[PDB]
Amino acid sequence: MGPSLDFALSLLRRNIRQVQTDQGHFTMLGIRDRLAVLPRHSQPGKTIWIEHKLVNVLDAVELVDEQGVDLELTLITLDTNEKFRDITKFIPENISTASDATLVINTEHMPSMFVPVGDVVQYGFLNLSGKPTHRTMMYNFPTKAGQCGGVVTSVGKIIGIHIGGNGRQGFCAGLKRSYFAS
Ligand SMILES: CCOC(=O)CC[C@H](C[C@@H]1CCNC1=O)NC(=O)[C@@H](CC(=O)[C@@H](NC(=O)c1cc(C)on1)C(C)C)Cc1ccc(F)cc1
């Protein structure tokens, strides 16, 4: 509710970017330095649109956890002029569920949008259009196409990235701090 909403708003300007790839429109969380995270499904190429600018991509590396499981997110590094404000400290050391979370969407079509998704609960194994992953979490909210990459936040942590849904529920890849270690 209110507390996750205001924390979510504090991330928006400095860290939550509108992007476009050949696959469509996505929300992108910048984490630190020139490092950001996107859904694998966005399939970033050699350039990517960020806000109004076509930006060269330094690399895109699929995020695979310490158990060898693809998390369906890719870590992208960018030929941006400025570094992102470092939000490492807001990514929890442990994958975290949360009550009354906020999902932040920021795309050209859904700009600066805060979605009260309610409680985010453990889900675990998830088969997303035939691609299996784990460590996912679920919220009973009817998320939509165009919300992938959306940032799931608690009172003061960034807990997940929206990756899929079935029309009545939504699912995020869980985040923990070690995923972003250099
Ligand atoms: C570029 C445009 O594409 C997009 O908009 C990305 C947006 C949507 C957001 C969905 C869109 C709808 N409700 C939502 O919240 N995401 C996907 O579509 C994903 C597929 C699903 O959500 C599928 N769901 C399940 O499999 C699923 C399983 C359970 C359990 O619940 N849902 C549905 C398409 C059927 C794409 C994907 C494929 C393979 C993966 F490794 C990982 C992801």
Layout of secondary structure:
Blueprint: H1 2-15, E1 16-21, E2 24-32, E3 35-39, E4 47-50, E5 53-64, E6 70-78, E7 98-105, E8 113-128, E9 131-139, E10 151-153, E11 158-165, E12 170-174
Antiparallel strand pairs: 1-2, 1-4, 2-3, 3-6, 4-5, 5-6, 7-8, 7-10, 8-9, 9-12, 10-11, 11-12
List each distinct ligand once: ligand AG7
Helix content: under 10%
Per CATH, the architecture of the largest domain is: Beta Barrel
- Terminal CA distance reads 33 Å
Strand content: over 45%
Count of beta strands: 12
Order of helices and strands: HEEEEEEEEEEEE
Q: How many helices in DSSP terms?
A: 1
The rough form would be described as globular
Name the quaternary structure. monomer
CATH class of the largest domain: Mainly Beta
Q: Strands across the major sheet, in which order?
A: 1-2-3-6-5-4
Structural classification? mainly beta
Tell me the major beta sheet: 6 strands, antiparallel, barrel
Q: State the fourth-level CATH superfamily of the largest domain.
A: Trypsin-like serine proteases
CATH topology term of the largest domain = Thrombin, subunit H
How many domains is the backbone divided into? 2
> Rg from C-alpha positions?
15 Å
Subunit structure: Interacts with RNA-directed RNA polymerase.
Protein name: Genome polyprotein
Family: Belongs to the picornaviruses polyprotein family.
Domain Peptidase C3: 2-180
Summarize the structure.
Helices cover 8% and strands 52% of the residues.
Written account of the structure:
It comes from Human enterovirus 71 (EV71). InterPro entries: PCV_3C_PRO, Peptidase_C3A/C3B_picornavir, Peptidase_S1_PA, Peptidase_S1_PA_chymotrypsin. One of its GO terms (molecular function) is cysteine-type endopeptidase activity. The protein is mainly β. The protein has two domains: 1-15 and 85-182, Beta Barrel (Thrombin, subunit H); 16-84, Trypsin-like serine proteases (Thrombin, subunit H, Beta Barrel). The chain has one helix at residues 2-15; strands at residues 16-21, 24-32, 35-39, 47-50, 53-64, 70-78, 98-105, 113-128, 131-139, 151-153, 158-165, 170-174. The chain has a six-stranded antiparallel beta barrel. The chain has a six-stranded antiparallel β-barrel with strand order 7-8-9-12-11-10. Strand 1 (16-21) and strand 2 form a beta hairpin. It binds the ligand CCOC(=O)CC[C@H](C[C@@H]1CCNC1=O)NC(=O)[C@@H](CC(=O)[C@@H](NC(=O)c1cc(C)on1)C(C)C)Cc1ccc(F)cc1.
